[PDB]
Design an enzyme around this catalytic site. Structure first.
Site, PDB file in Angstrom:
ATOM      1  N   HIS A 142     -48.791 -75.083 -31.754  1.00  0.00           N
ATOM      2  CA  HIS A 142     -50.221 -75.842 -31.926  1.00  0.00           C
ATOM      3  C   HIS A 142     -49.627 -77.615 -31.920  1.00  0.00           C
ATOM      4  CE1 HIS A 142     -52.554 -72.521 -32.914  1.00  0.00           C
ATOM      5  NE2 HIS A 142     -51.937 -72.195 -33.791  1.00  0.00           N
TER       6      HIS A 142
HETATM    7 ZN   LIG Z   1     -50.812 -68.221 -35.606  1.00  0.00          ZN
END
Ligand SMILES: [Zn+2]
Ligand SMILES: [Zn+2]
Ligand SMILES: [Zn+2]
EC number: 3.5.1.98
Lengths: 43, 47, 256, 98, 370, 168, 239
Positions: E133
């Site tokens: 992320h």
């Molecule tokens: Zn995740």
């Protein structure tokens, strides 16, 4: 000829066996745009 | 309605006009087209 | 539909080729990416080369939260049994984290002590370390010393071990070992309650329908929904088969 | 039950118009629900693949090999695609040749 | 011993916050279960070499990495503005040894890539990594440095095409944004779309420029199970391996797609989450298995231990051996993670539609004149 | 007391309202056509056709009032809540230059269109009011005529760091 | 004079407290659809004029049945149906071309795929817009979108004769179709089930057919050749 029938799972390490399209809740999984736009046999 | 029938008639004839495909090449990859006995040529002399 | 395709002069193969791409109008960059200004398209990256600049992307940036879909704003409500299991796991993690951090620092300081003690006695008395004792990961050592001693004696003990290691190390090893033994005894004394909670709550943590099926079966057992199902099936049969469906059946059960 | 009848005639019409590629008509018997029309379609079907009914507790279909068992999920839209089998052939022949 | 296992004996001692989901303690749990299952002999254990600022600035910006090097939980109050600019401080908290943990994870990943390049190994396992992320200039989703992207860049020095398969319940937003405009890396991510964290991941995000049709997103609804996940995962990966034939695979084995997860909403079991690994191992390509999500430590530990054993080839026992974390495992003490009921929501029509769309996209790379 | 804004300018103003407020798009602050530049162009074009010296004088002093009021007004009642961050950034970047040399016609027309409500509170002589208002009318006509050169063509998306900075 | 106007303007502005900009009410209420917000923002005024979404709808307030438009099923083959807030249509969230993962929000009106406003370039009409009826019969340039609604026996049969005849005709068509198909069995089998081993023949013993050469084009496009000689039929190596 045996591995061709229900081949929607590619076995383990092979490219796909058969192709997959949608079936709009038809109980005969053919009915599609394929069905509605294919030849059966002032304008 | 009468405009769409005339609008599509001209466009349809233009597509049929370009549908006539007759070309000869050697080493382009262009399409999955009508005239590809080309690929038989570059693969043949080796095989 | 065949008449329309004949009007347009489109073969069915070409229609099937064009359908999925020409039905829904979305931007080419996807519905969640957008272009950047030219200014911030050349921010520094002092480690890249030409090969990396050719590959990585610097123009199109994704939407983390700035579109209509900010982030996940719906937390999945859990069953009380899953919540009890999570609380149990958290308790275990707290105890084990503290015990293992203390033990790791004890072992590291024991290694330092073994090195400086294998070192002969003159250098033993005149030796010194650097801020951090040369540990590649000094954060655990700092944190554990702070926690075991105080927010105030931490600096005192730190400077002491920095200046005079050979005398100071045995005392801090003894203190850390003592506190570790205390924590271990408390953990052993608290374990059986954890086992009991885990036992009582385990199976119901998988049995999620034990909580979510009554409110869904009341609907199927009700009567209004059944009458509505009958009517809608009649309408559907009449729309599908106009010539038939005057001899059809809405429901056909098999009792074998 | 007009749905099963319409489905049957639709599948046979698709096999006529070449949409469902005989493995694809043998399946799409997700409408099983009865053993008698399968036993009656026996005498009209022949590859060595006649259906096989053992107690319809199991509906495994014959072939020249031992025959596949029906999948739990529906006969999920298995149409035929030529480039796939061509690439599989290329790979297998390369491997065997090497 | 073609499996190179990376593990630094410190990784488990870093702590996020008071009640945070991400706990590097799971890596220590996995390693203890391994060393007591005796996989330590069949594996190849390498204590990784720490990354450097020059190694992380390959994918991240110099100011961001300098901030990560300089921050401290005490000076956070003075560094407040740059924090809210760099996303560090709310759900990616600033804790002790942040830079050290990031260095450990990124070093694991880069070392895995270098092993695959040098040929000393064919499978490289790193559980401490997988933070997918992180973005070019801001942290996100408990992630700080994109070790997956650093590893892909190290693989591309020798390999011409690289596949990245995400089976974490969230979208691989960082890696997709990194490789959105290139055809040498294809990113296939299966995720839960709708009202969920990353927000990105529509079926229509398919790349731009040269990387048109090289991002593959498979959105899924709540409560997918083993059979449904198999029916969506095996066709798509086979078609990918057919049309875009990669020379190296990077598999993010994230286990928040399991059943009973604090943040996930799926229903996979140990078998449904491992048939993925098996299908990908079945192609005899060099592969890096990186960790990822996973916020229930018992399930995470047992599933990752099983997957390590499956990659090494050994079929581990069914009873957990004596380890220093035995009580963590429930009233059964078995190596398994059963599924729950949690009525499914993925209809066969939905799955078939999204699969057909993805297949058409992958086919357009070789049909569809240039 | 009313003005005659062309419909093209009305459409452009509403589109800019939407783009800046809801779609998170801003304008590149250093403009290629300057506010001072456009003011000077219109002034030259009108004086080159004016008739008598009294008119020359009143037009000159009107243009002077316009430029000084812009420079004194921009940062107080001419920006949305999504542009104050950009404004302070631009002030930090160029603390010696001035707004009349920084901003553009995209904001000059906000000033022009808003002038009626300001002359509502102001109550000077009707002669001065009508002179100034006719001048504003002619200016709006000149701008909507020369659209191709004075107005920006595409807006710019604000970066994630900028959005996290503003947050309003 | 206007010098004094400038003085009064300067005095007003430096006396008062700054505020944020808002264009006059004339320009604001000019167009149709646009409208101010709570903090001076721009919000389109097309929201649900009535006020969680009811997942399954079965009966309508007008008795009209609730069947999907594309598949004609009844919100029970799939656990959710959607009602278009612009027409009298209902769609399965799975029948739309990109299938909707989750149902939309019950706040914003949802528009079905059977409207022309999805592919028109957006425009704005003023809120004083007399609908003009254009008399030009053919050839009217209209920017595609601003054309509003194109404004301009009781037999008492009572017989089932035609219904019986239609039923028998349907059965006869079915009988002929089934007869033809079930005769073309035993050849459908041979040419569609052994079709996987003849490709193996024309691959092993490399005989050039159109599909083989297309597969080789596929492999060349995967390897991304530029100007060198093609290696051979069995030695392009994405093996
Ligand atoms: Zn995740
Ligand atoms: Zn439908
Ligand atoms: Zn509609």
């Amino acid at each position: 000829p045996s591995s061709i029938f229900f081949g929607s799972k590619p076995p383990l390490g092979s490219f796909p066996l058969r192709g997959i399209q949608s079936s709009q809740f038809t109980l005969s999984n053919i009915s599609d745009l394929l069905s509605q736009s294919r030849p059966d046999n002032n304008e | 309605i009468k405009d769409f029938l005339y609008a599509i008639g001209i466009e349809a004839k233009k597509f049929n006009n370009e549908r006539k495909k007759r070309e000869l090449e050697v080493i382009p990859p262009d399409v999955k087209s009508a005239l590809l006995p080309a690929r038989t040529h570059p693969n043949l002399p080796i095989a | 539909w065949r008449s329309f395709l004949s009007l347009t002069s489109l073969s069915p193969e070409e229609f099937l080729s064009v359908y999925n791409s020409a039905c829904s109008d979305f931007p080419e960059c996807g519905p969640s990416y957008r272009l950047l200004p030219v200014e911030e398209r050349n921010i520094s990256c002092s480690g890249r080369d030409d090969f990396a600049w050719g590959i990585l992307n610097d123009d199109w940036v994704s939407h983390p939260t700035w579109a209509s879909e900010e982030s996940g704003f719906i937390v999945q409500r859990k069953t009380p049994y899953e919540e009890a299991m999570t609380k149990l796991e958290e308790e275990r993690y707290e105890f084990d984290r503290h015990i293992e951090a203390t033990s790791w620092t004890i072992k590291s300081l024991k290694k330092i002590q073994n090195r400086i003690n294998e070192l002969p006695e003159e250098e033993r008395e005149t030796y010194t370390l650097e801020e951090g004792l040369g540990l590649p990961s000094k954060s655990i050592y700092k944190k554990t010393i702070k926690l075991v001693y105080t927010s105030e004696h931490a600096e005192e003990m730190f400077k002491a071990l920095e200046r005079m290691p050979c005398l100071t190390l045995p005392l801090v090893i003894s203190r850390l070992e003592e506190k570790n033994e205390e924590w271990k005894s408390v953990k052993r004394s608290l374990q059986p309650g954890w086992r009991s909670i885990e036992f009582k709550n385990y199976d119901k943590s998988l049995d999620s329908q034990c909580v979510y099926f009554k409110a869904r079966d009341k609907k199927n057992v009700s009567s209004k929904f059944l009458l509505a199902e009958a009517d809608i099936l009649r309408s559907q049969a009449k729309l599908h088969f106009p010539l038939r469906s005057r001899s059809a059946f809405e429901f056909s059960f098999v009792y074998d | 039950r007009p749905y099963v009848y319409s489905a049957f005639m639709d599948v046979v019409k698709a096999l006529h118009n070449e949409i469902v590629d005989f493995p694809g008509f043998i399946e799409r018997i997700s409408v099983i629900l009865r053993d008698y029309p399968d036993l009656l379609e026996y005498l009209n079907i022949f590859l060595p693949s006649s259906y096989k009914y053992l107690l319809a507790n199991f509906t495994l279909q014959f072939t020249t090999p031992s025959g596949p068992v029906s999948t739990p999920s529906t006969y999920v839209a298995t149409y035929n695609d030529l480039p796939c089998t061509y690439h599989r052939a290329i790979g297998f022949v390369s491997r065997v040749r090497r | 011993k073609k499996v190179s296992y990376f593990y630094d004996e410190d990784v488990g001692n870093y702590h996020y916050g008071p009640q945070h989901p991400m706990k590097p303690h799971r890596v220590r749990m996995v390693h203890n279960l391994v060393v007591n299952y005796n996989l330590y002999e069949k594996l190849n254990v390498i204590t990784p070499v720490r990354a450097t600022r020059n190694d992380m600035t390959r994918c991240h910006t110099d100011e961001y990495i300098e901030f990560l090097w300089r921050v401290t939980p005490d000076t956070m109050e003075k560094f407040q503005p740059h924090q809210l600019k760099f996303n560090v401080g709310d759900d990616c908290p600033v804790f002790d040894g942040l830079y050290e943990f990031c260095s450990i994870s990124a070093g694991g990943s880069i070392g895995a890539a270098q092993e695959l390049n040098s040929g000393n190994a064919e499978i490289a396992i790193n559980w401490a990594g997988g933070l997918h992320h992180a973005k070019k200039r801001e942290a996100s989703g408990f992630c700080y440095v994109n070790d997956i992207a650093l590893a892909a860049l190290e693989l591309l020095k020798y390999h011409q095409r690289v596949l990245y398969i995400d089976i974490d319940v969230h979208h691989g937003d960082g890696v997709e944004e990194f490789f959105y405009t290139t055809d040498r890396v294809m990113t296939c991510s299966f995720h839960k779309f709708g009202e969920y964290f990353p927000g990105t991941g529509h079926i229509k995000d398919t790349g731009i420029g040269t990387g048109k049709n090289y991002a593959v997103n498979v959105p899924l609804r709540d409560g997918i199970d083993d059979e449904s996940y198999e029916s969506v995962f095996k066709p798509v990966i086979s078609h990918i391996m057919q049309w875009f034939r990669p020379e190296a695979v990077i598999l993010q084995c994230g286990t928040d797609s399991l059943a009973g997860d604090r943040l996930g909403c799926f229903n996979l079991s140990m078998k449904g989450h491992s048939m993925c690994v098996d299908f990908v191992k079945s192609f005899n390509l060099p592969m890096i298995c990186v960790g990822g999500g996973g916020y229930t430590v018992r399930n995470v530990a047992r599933v990752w231990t099983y997957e390590t054993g499956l990659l090494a080839g050994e079929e581990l026992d069914e009873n957990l051996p004596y380890n220093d974390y035995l009580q963590y495992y429930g009233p059964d003490y078995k190596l398994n993670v059963l599924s729950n009921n949690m009525e499914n929501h993925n209809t066969r029509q939905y799955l078939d539609s999204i699969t057909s769309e993805i297949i058409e996209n992958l086919r357009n790379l070789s049909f569809a004149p240039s | 007391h009313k003005i005659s804004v062309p419909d093209v300018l009305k459409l452009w103003l509403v589109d800019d309202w939407e783009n800046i407020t809801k779609n998170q798009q801003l304008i590149a602050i250093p403009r290629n056509p300057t506010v001072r530049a456009a003011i000077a162009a219109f002034r030259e074009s009108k004086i080159s056709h004016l008739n008598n010296e009294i008119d020359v004088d009143v037009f000159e002093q009107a243009m002077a009032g316009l430029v000084i009021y812009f420079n004194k007004c921009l940062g107080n009642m001419l920006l949305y809540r999504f542009e104050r961050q950009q404004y302070l950034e631009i002030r930090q970047q160029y603390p010696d230059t001035e707004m009349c040399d920084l901003y553009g016609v995209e904001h000059l027309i906000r000033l022009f269109v808003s002038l009626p409500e300001l002359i509502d509170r102001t109550n000077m002589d009707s002669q001065s009011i009508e002179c100034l208002l006719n001048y504003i009318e002619e200016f709006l006509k000149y701008l909507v005529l020369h659209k191709d050169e004075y107005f920006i063509k595409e807006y710019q998306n604000a970066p994630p760091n900028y959005r996290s900075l503003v947050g309003v | 004079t206007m010098v004094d106007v400038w003085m009064q303007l300067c005095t007003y502005i430096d006396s008062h407290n700054p505020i944020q900009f808002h264009l006059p009410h004339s320009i604001s209420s000019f167009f149709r659809g646009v409208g101010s917000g709570v903090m001076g923002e721009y919000i389109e005024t097309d929201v649900l004029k009535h006020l969680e979404r009811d997942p399954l709808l079965l009966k309508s307030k007008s008795g009209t049945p609730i069947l999907c438009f594309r598949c004609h099923k009844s919100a029970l083959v799939s656990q959710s149906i959607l009602a278009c807030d612009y027409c009298n249509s209902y769609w399965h969230p799975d029948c739309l071309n990109p299938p909707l993962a989750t149902l939309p929000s019950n706040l914003r009106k949802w528009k079905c795929p059977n409207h022309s406003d999805h592919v028109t370039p957006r425009y704005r009409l003023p809120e004083k817009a007399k609908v003009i009826r254009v008399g030009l019969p053919r050839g009217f340039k209209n920017k595609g979108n601003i054309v509003i609604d194109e404004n301009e026996k009781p037999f008492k049969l009572n017989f089932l004769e035609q219904i019986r005849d239609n039923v028998i005709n349907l059965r006869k068509m079915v009988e002929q179709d089934e007869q033809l198909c079930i005769e073309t069995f035993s050849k459908f089998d041979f040419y569609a089930t052994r079709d996987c081993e003849l490709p193996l023949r024309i691959l092993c013993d490399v005989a050039n057919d159109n599909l083989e050469n297309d597969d080789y084009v596929l492999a060349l496009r995967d390897l991304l050749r530029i100007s060198k000689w093609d290696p051979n039929q069995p030695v392009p190596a994405p093996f």
